[PDB]
Amino acid sequence: ELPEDNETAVYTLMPMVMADQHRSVSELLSNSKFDVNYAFGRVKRSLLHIAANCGSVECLVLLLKKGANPNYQDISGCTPLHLAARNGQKKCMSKLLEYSADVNICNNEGLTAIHWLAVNGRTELLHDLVQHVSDVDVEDAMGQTALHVACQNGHKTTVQCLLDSGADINRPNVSGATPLYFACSHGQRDTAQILLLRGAKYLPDKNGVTPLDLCVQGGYGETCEVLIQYHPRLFQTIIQMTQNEDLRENMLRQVLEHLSQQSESQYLKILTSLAEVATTNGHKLLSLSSNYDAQMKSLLRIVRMFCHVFRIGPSSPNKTPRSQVFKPLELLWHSLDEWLVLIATELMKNKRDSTEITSILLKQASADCQDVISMTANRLSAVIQAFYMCCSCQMPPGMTSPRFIEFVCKHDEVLKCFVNRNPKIIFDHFHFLLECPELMSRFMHIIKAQPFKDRCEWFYEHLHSGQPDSDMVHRPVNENDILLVHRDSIFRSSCEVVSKANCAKLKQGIAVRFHGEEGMGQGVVREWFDILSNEIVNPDYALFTQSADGTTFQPNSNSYVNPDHLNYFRFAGQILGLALNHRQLVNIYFTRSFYKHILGIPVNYQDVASIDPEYAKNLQWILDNDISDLGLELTFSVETDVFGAMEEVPLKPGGGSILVTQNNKAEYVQLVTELRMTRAIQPQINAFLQGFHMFIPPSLIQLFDEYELELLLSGMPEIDVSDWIKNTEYTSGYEREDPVIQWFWEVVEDITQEERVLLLQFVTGSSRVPHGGFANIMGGSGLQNFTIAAVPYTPNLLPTSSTCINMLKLPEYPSKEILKDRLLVALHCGS
């Protein structure tokens, strides 16, 4: 039986009430003196609350007959009505009402039975409850009625019952919220549509936030079309909201897309409105007085939606009207052309001013005015950028509008003048050069003159735009696309699936999973590059031959033995370019000649020494001295490898009859270069370039020279831990095991540089280190600063690291000797 102590009694009663032993509790209740109303615990919840919450109907009637109060409220103010109401136990409701349970009681926040019942939307219970409830429009502390939450959760049947009962349809909240306002907040369709039928009023909140403010922010296109159905006037308000910078661009695209597929008429309306507002902003943008940042951002913002929405075609559920909307834009283009003429007249003024400057030079306030024009040029640079995007979407991709090409060349001096005045203009607005190779040639020399740093980031943003990124999404790719091969024979296994599997599927994925294993980690995949890379330069495959210096690799002249070397070299190009696409490093050091082949830059005389230093010394000497009087008797014919046979072949058609002299010695050395290093392995290079350019377009990579490409492609050659800590000599580090940190600093400097790299190799998975030092460490989720986590020390414990995350688990070694011994042992085993 229950003890005399209530605390033990409830602990005994509490487990049975769930089991619903109707008989068992009866004897204990009858033959014990414990008070049912007693509150237990800090929450002070009565036993009736627990019984009411669960479905044990029997215990309720026994407890109530014993004197349990159904009206009792705990500290939270919730009564047995609320707990039973949430679970919708109709039996509990009937018995509660039978024994004098009143439904009008409210909690501390004002929530009552109707509110909890409304949230769950049990309309059957609502039918009977409303007949008993005194008032159905009871407001909470924040002044919100029952219908407010019911509409928010989108219970179509709940609202119908409440309206039939006379529930208020236009009750404003404390802030002024309308039940339509809350319905649009969570993007409910049925409830919103029902409210319009009854004639719900449209009013803004007291705070000044209109209902459409959240709808556009929420991006629920379903609610927009119903709203616009009865209020076409608000359609224009959507266009006006584009000007405000507080709204996210991504949301506005999706909502505008959904409206587009509805009918072509609205599709035209969206385009026309965007062009009209764009025209107004453009004229405002040109004005010097108007805010410069806000206007260009607004114009670029609007243009982006117009460009994207234009590319989205309609559906049945391609004629002039797509060009008519450009007529409002041709007004903008016409002004741009006139401005391009006006600046051309400005060049005449500048040229006229140049006459005064040049005249003074020959015989040997304006700064502010030039700055304003330069600022105007910056604003002019935004509109021309918009014009390019409109032209780009004017037809399928990969083609530049012939109209675009003709006038841009017609104003070549204008563009070249602006870049000189403001080199940042290429790195601020004038970005579209990378698409058209013809326009690249005009500005490539200008761009290359700019600092390399400004060139690096501009390259990154363009290339990464087309990435099949999944890092932040971290959604696994379809297994059909993910390769599943055994690591054994990495070179053979990787190529087999790539060639056999569909090309489209492979290029759409990034995951690298081994057959029969679930392993997936950036460090593990980064290690996969290392093993694969080493096999490529492995002399056994004979694909690449060690350089004379012994620090670089280039394709072997004997690689032609393998019948499928074209295909395998093509596969290698794909893998190497894939690493560059996502920016992981490849440990291979290629020769200077090889990197030039990637960019297509012709080799020079110095590259000859890569194979035969003695022959190069002859080619540099011949150029450095006149040979007309030396009687060399050497024509344009040199021995070269032809399909493995040493034969005498002219360097050019009829070269054997052309004597080499001072006039034509410069090219003679040049021709000899490709004779040795390029033609010999030209078939191999052709396949390799084919694979590499699949992911890295030649124009984009051409921007950088051979040296810059290797630094990006292979990484920083020189490293030092001082960069990570940005200091040289402190008495303490992060205030974490500082004496151990000092020993950690003492050991790293003592150990040679080469073995410190291996320590980074284990944690990172790549022998090389990214450019920029420790400030640009790529971990599992891309940019991730290197960190070390302390661990309790145990005897013979070696450090460990989860390679996907570039972090280290360093035990709290009590002495430096243990610290250095343990990491040395890890190096031996970790090799």
Binding site: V43, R45, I75, L111, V119, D140, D190, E222, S802
Partner: protein, 178 residues
């Protein structure tokens, strides 16, 4: 019409009760009340046909450590939850929840969600934690925890200020559908 079952599992005093009451009523309780059982509902749309969302919650007591499994049957999604300001609960995921949920229902997708983001943003909270020599849980390793426990996605949300609350259920419904 179709219906799905979703469950919230996590340590006590984490914010599971606040997450569902705040989402469904915009009201934040002022007092501290553990629970024994709860239920909620919502709606979504699929191909023009409404789809109902059913949400269940569970407590943390030893007796309910066995009844909580009894509420799993025919569950279609799980939302493992932990307190972003309490490292012990986060550590308990490996010790208790990840083995426990997988032992009973390993097949169904798992979503990791962090609550108490409001206390995570409050400056006074870190001050008292600093005096106690404690640091809040962070994002990048939390995603690693999600991978370690096999959770499909990791999210962070608030219940008082509702920062990122709505995304929690959007990813849950999106993840289960696809």
């Amino acid at each position: 019409m179709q219906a799905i079952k979703c469950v919230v599992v996590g340590d006590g005093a984490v914010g599971k009760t606040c997450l569902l009451i705040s989402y469904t009523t915009n009201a934040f309780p002022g007092e501290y009340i553990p629970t024994v059982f709860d239920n909620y509902s919502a709606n979504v749309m699929v191909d023009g046909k409404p789809v109902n969302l059913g949400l269940w919650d569970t407590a943390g007591l030893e007796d309910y450590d066995r009844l909580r499994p009894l509420s799993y049957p025919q569950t279609d999604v799980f939302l493992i939850c932990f307190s972003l300001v309490s490292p012990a609960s986060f550590e308990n995921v490996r010790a208790k929840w990840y083995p426990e949920v997988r032992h009973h229902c390993p097949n169904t997708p798992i979503i990791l969600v962090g609550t108490k983001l409001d206390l995570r943003d409050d400056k006074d909270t870190i001050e008292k934690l600093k005096e106690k020599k404690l640091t809040p849980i962070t994002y990048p390793q939390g995603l690693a925890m999600a991978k370690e426990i096999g959770a499909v996605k990791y999210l962070e949300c608030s219940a008082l200020t509702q920062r990122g609350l709505k995304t929690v259920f959007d990813e849950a419904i999106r993840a289960v559908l696809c």
